[PDB]
């Protein structure tokens, strides 16, 4: 229902950057890029770190994952 | 009809970071946050900037933004 507010959509990024690390998938540079990544994604939109877990709280993409979303679209523009 | 791959993923997230500072919506500070952050994210994933265009042309996630995919989302969990 919700129109993707910057903040809600920086959640998500996050939280999967987040689930990437948490399942310890990437590399350790890649890790580290993350890191500094989403520091700078906070301050890009102006949110903390640990704000996401109330973003994803407060908007409707709540058992979910952002690729999990990106699953469920399907636009094949055949022009 | 994509799983989200991890290329796939970054590509849509990159986009739209790209879109934000495309319509110079975003501050200064934070375009640069994601300057800074877009070479981290390319680093993690393994992959070029300018390969997004690549990315969101092979993947049929084409004719639509990160947004617009998280608007089409509605999960409401209510436990």
């Given at each position: 229902?919700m129109?993707?507010?910057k903040?809600?959509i920086?959640?998500?990024?996050?939280?999967?950057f987040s689930?990437?690390?948490?399942?310890?998938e990437?590399?350790?540079?890649?890790?580290?890029?993350?890191?500094?990544?989403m520091?700078?994604?906070?301050?890009?939109?102006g949110f903390?770190?640990?704000?996401?877990?109330?973003?994803?709280?407060?908007?409707?993409?709540?058992?979910?994952?952002?690729?999990?979303?990106?699953?469920?679209?399907?636009?094949?523009?055949?022009?």
């Open positions: 229902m129109s993707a507010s903040e809600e920086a959640a998500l990024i996050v939280n999967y689930s990437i690390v948490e399942k310890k990437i590399s350790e540079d890649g890790a580290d890029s993350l890191n500094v990544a520091d700078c994604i906070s301050e890009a939109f903390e770190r640990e704000a996401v877990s109330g973003i994803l709280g407060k908007s409707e993409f709540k058992g979910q994952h952002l690729a999990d979303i990106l699953n469920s679209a399907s636009r094949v523009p055949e022009s």
